[PDB]
Paper text:
In the presence of dsDNA, [name] produces cGAMP from GTP and ATP, which activates STING as a second messenger. The structure of [name] adopts the typical nucleotidyl transferase fold, consisting of the N-terminal α/β core and the C-terminal helix bundle. An HCCC type zinc finger (ZnF) exists between the N-terminal core and the C-terminal bundle.
A zinc ion is coordinated by the side chains of His390, Cys396, Cys397 and Cys404, and forms a protruding loop structure. In our structure, Leu174 is oriented toward the solvent, as seen in the mouse and porcine apo structures, and the catalytic pocket is partially disordered. These observations suggested that a similar structural change would occur in human [name] upon DNA binding for catalytic activation. The concave DNA binding cleft of human [name] is composed of a positively charged cluster of lysine and arginine residues, mainly from α1, α4, and α5. In contrast, the ZnF in the human structure forms a partial helix with Lys400 (equivalent to Ser388 and Asp377 in the mouse and porcine proteins, respectively), which is exposed towards the solvent, suggesting an additional interaction between the ZnF of human [name] and dsDNA. Our structure of the human [name] apo form resembles those of the mouse (69% sequence identity, r.m.s. deviation = 1.40 Å for 315 Cα atoms) and porcine (74% sequence identity, r.m.s. deviation = 1.11 Å for 312 Cα atoms) apo proteins.
Author numbering: 162 to 217, 223 to 254, 261 to 288, 306 to 362, 371 to 425, 428 to 521
Write the structure that this text describes.
């Protein structure tokens, strides 16, 4: 549809500005990586490479991963996503048997501080980088994910098995808990997203999946930008999660034809609206973890965002107007 394509054209205008800043961040990040490598605790550290930039302007997100030897997890309450970690030289942060996140974060923060979720939010001039520490575990994924990643009918059972052989990550968050992270898998599915292995590799198989995700993120950004903080709790992660569920529901590449961009976008919006109304948005990897629970976002805010998105959809997205 013309309006949506005009919006996608407008977003392209900002590409080089994002590009150039990325190389400035990358220079600083490359610089911290080497100094973190000197410290005993962080000697194995490396760059995970994930998030918006890696997937397809002043804000950037970077994850530092650290290989931790044979890990053992303990689920904080019945949270599904939060854990204490223990083992089957990081013993300096051991609270007896349990790895202290705030001990690890304090030194991690101090080293970067010396050099100059999120751990560090740091600055080169008008560049905000969030830097996150992630423990890497090459073990089987925890049981809370056993019913997650429901890609079998879309990306295939074989791909699901291959993805679950990859490591998983833990990011520091009733204190001292770590949360599961699969940002590496999120990037892999967005960049290898078709039922056809050649989806978006030639002119006959251009789908509109990525453009739909971009449009959904831009929709939420624009609605937030209009308010000085009713929508503070909503993030691009909610939009991305909802988008993954919509790919599951529409597994065929022929359901994402570029010429059907308007209909595909409507699908994404209508699903996100359903999530708002039912107050349920399951983490794509951890189904019992409800991103839209009342513990996380009050009923009123969810109700409020429902009204605006409903208004936008019923009037052809005036927020996207010239
Ligand atoms: Zn494609």
């Amino acid at each position: 549809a013309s309006k949506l394509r005009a919006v996608l054209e407008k977003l392209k205008l900002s590409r080089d500005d994002i590009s150039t800043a990325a190389g400035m961040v990358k220079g600083v990040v490359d610089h911290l990586l080497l100094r973190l490598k000197c410290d005993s605790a962080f000697r194995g550290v490396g760059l995970l490479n994930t998030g918006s930039y890696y997937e397809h302007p002043n804000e950037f997100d970077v994850m530092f991963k650290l290989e931790v030897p044979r890990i053992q997890l303990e689920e904080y309450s019945n949270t599904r996503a939060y854990y204490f970690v223990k083992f089957k030289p990081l013993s300096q942060f051991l609270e007896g048997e349990i790895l202290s996140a705030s001990k690890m974060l304090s030194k991690f923060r101090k080293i970067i501080k010396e050099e100059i979720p999120a751990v560090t939010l740091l600055i080169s001039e008008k560049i905000s980088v969030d830097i996150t520490l992630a423990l890497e575990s090459k073990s089987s994924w925890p049981a809370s994910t056993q019913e997650g990643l429901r890609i079998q009918n879309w990306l295939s059972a074989k791909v699901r098995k291959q993805l679950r052989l990859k490591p998983f990550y833990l990011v520091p968050k009733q204190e001292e808990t770590w949360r599961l992270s699969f940002s590496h898998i999120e990037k892999e599915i967005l960049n290898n997203h078709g039922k056809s292995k050649t989806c978006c590799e030639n002119k006959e198989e251009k789908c509109c999946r990525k453009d739909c995700l971009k449009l959904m993120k831009y929709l939420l950004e624009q609605l937030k930008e209009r308010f000085k903080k009713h929508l503070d709790k909503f993030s691009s992660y909610h939009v991305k999660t909802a988008f993954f569920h919509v790919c599951t529901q529409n597994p065929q590449d022929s359901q994402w034809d570029r010429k059907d961009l308007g209909l595909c976008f409507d699908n994404c919006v209508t699903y996100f609206l359903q999530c708002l109304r039912t107050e349920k948005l399951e983490n794509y990897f951890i189904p019992e973890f409800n991103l839209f629970s009342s513990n996380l976002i009050d009923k009123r805010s969810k109700e409020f965002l429902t009204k605006q998105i409903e208004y936008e959809r019923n009037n052809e997205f005036p927020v996207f107007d010239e």
